[PDB]
Structure 1
């Protein structure tokens, strides 16, 4: 499964995911399922920022903490949106709202509630994807057009199928907590 992650995600995603695990004292060579999960969430974030206009989305995830907070504070100073308590994943210029992105192997609506009851931010939007293609977001607002969204689930499904082809999906489907 370690080899699979490296042959599945581009090297910039791999590097980003290892740094994040090491920053928390976890070994990518060992927590291979968390490894893959960080990569997938990272790749989905890059794809969300790709739908819509060329500059619709400022991306927060994947930057070091200092730059990440530099972006968010800069947006709050210019537009006046409330400053989130936690680093969210993107900013949506067209709609004036921070976005949180979740990717779960579990059921989509439970993960919604989990990250709703902990976000406590009125003006931060939650958008959740599954590998089985069930997506769940806030106030029934899903931001991107069905076409951008479809490309993301298709990518997520494609990951699922090759993990299964290498017989990794079952263990990857249990590890989540």
Structure 2
């Protein structure tokens, strides 16, 4: 598909590979479900830019690993620090703030997607941070974890991705797909 060719020429190959591994691990093929292929690559790159944000070895990346290794690291963090075991796999863990983080990249209002995630988690301790393709963000307790400059790069990157899809007339079908 055209979306697949764009995703592959838009994101770096390591990111594309982790999304491919993660989709086939859950029975989905990137060549058919090309919109979900785009969304996993975006979500992946955001998590890695996020993890790059802040100090050194600050975030233990949970997303991008296979399920059983990801839960292995979560169980170790839980028995290490003593925090509650979340019901759903998060994306990061903040060693500085001592909390798991769920990262979301949406095509709706940050309030709606935050509400969906906050009610589905129902763990209270897991921190939530939502980005949108228009530069908007919402985070638990208005605590945005990272500095402004790091968050602004993610927002800028998201909007750069949005324009690239639109130039290829793919942005409309992509938002009408989440």
TM-score of the two chains, using structure 1 as the length reference = 0.96
Return the alpha-carbon distance in structure 1 between the equivalents of residues 27 and 84 of structure 2.
32
In 2, Cα distance between the equivalents of 1:113 and 1:23?
28
Alpha-carbon distance between aligned partners in 2 of 1:10 and 1:61, rounded to the nearest angstrom: 17
Alpha-carbon deviations, 1:62-120, whole Å to 9, x = none? 01112111111111111111111111000000000000000001111100000111101
For each residue in 1:120-166, what CA deviation from the matched residue of structure 2 results, as whole angstroms up to 9, or x when unmatched? 11110000000101101111111000011001101111101111111
User: What secondary structure, in the 3-state scheme, does the structure 2 residue paired with 1:17 have?
Assistant: helix
8 Å CA contact retained: 2:22, 2:64: no
What is the TM-score with the length of structure 2 in the denominator? 0.96
Corresponding residue pairs, total? 176
Bigger mean CA offset, 54-63 vs 9-18: 9-18
* Misfit runs of 4+, over 3 Å: none
Task: State the superposition RMSD in angstroms.
Answer: 0.9
Question: Is structure 2 residue 51 aligned with structure 1 residue 49?
Answer: yes
SS in 1 for 2:52: coil
Work out which of the residue numbers 81, 98, 106 in structure 1 matches 2:108: 106
